[PDB]
């Protein structure tokens, strides 16, 4: 799969727009209920979990949801990685992992908005 993200930083705040995802795969032949969960790692204070809403019965969800990280300096973010996970929300069994990508923030020009597709790995 692949996820389209817009990443920007303004007024002390990191903005991660989760736009959409294509080509999720499951090993059960059923369409998943994807949501996106992010952390900013390391997270010693345990405050960085963010999640989108659930998109139902689709391998190609559109979210157009913004995840917000307040209170981080650009300096601090250079030593953080955005850990993005896509999971399927399940009511009768455990939520399970569909794919993910980890993005070191030092690779980003945080003075601009970076919009691109990222390949998901399992």
From Swiss-Prot:
Expression (tissue specificity): Expressed in columnar and transitional epithelia, mononuclear cells, smooth muscle cells, and endothelial cells lining capillaries and small venules (at protein level). Ubiquitously expressed, with highest levels in heart, placenta and ovary, and lowest levels in the kidney. Detected at low levels in islets of Langerhans from type 2 diabetes mellitus individuals.
Protein name listed in UniProt: Phosphatidylinositol 4-phosphate 3-kinase C2 domain-containing subunit alpha
Lineage of source species: Eukaryota, Metazoa, Chordata, Craniata, Vertebrata
Post-translational modification: Phosphorylated upon insulin stimulation; which may lead to enzyme activation.
Residue interval(s) of motif Nuclear localization signal: 48-59
Superkingdom, natural source: Eukaryota
Family under the similarity heading: Belongs to the PI3/PI4-kinase family.
Domain C2 per the UniProt entry, residue ranges: 1-118
Disease: Oculoskeletodental syndrome: An autosomal recessive syndrome characterized by congenital cataracts, short stature, dysmorphic features with coarse facies, dental anomalies, multiple skeletal abnormalities, and neurological manifestations. Other recurrent features include hearing loss, secondary glaucoma, and nephrocalcinosis.
Entry's localization field: Cell membrane; Cytoplasmic vesicle, Clathrin-coated vesicle; Nucleus; Cytoplasm
Organism from which the protein derives: Homo sapiens (Human)
Disulfide-bonded cysteines: none
Function as written in the Swiss-Prot or TrEMBL entry: Generates phosphatidylinositol 3-phosphate (PtdIns3P) and phosphatidylinositol 3,4-bisphosphate (PtdIns(3,4)P2) that act as second messengers. Has a role in several intracellular trafficking events. Functions in insulin signaling and secretion. Required for translocation of the glucose transporter SLC2A4/GLUT4 to the plasma membrane and glucose uptake in response to insulin-mediated RHOQ activation.
Record note on quaternary structure: Part of a complex with ERBB2 and EGFR. Interacts with clathrin trimers. Interacts with SBF2/MTMR13.
């Amino acid at each position: 799969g692949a996820v389209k993200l817009s990443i920007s930083y303004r007024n002390g705040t990191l903005f991660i727009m989760v736009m959409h995802i294509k080509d999720l795969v499951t090993e059960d032949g059923a369409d998943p209920n994807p949501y996106v969960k992010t952390y900013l790692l390391p997270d010693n204070h345990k405050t960085s979990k963010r999640k989108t809403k659930i998109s139902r019965k689709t391998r190609n969800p559109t979210f157009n949801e913004m995840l917000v990280y307040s209170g981080y300096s650009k300096e601090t973010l250079r030593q953080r990685e955005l850990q993005l996970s896509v999971l399927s929300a399940e009511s009768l069994r455990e939520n399970f992992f569909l794919g993910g990508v980890t993005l070191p923030l030092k690779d980003f020009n945080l003075s601009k908005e970076t919009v691109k597709w990222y390949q998901l790995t399992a």
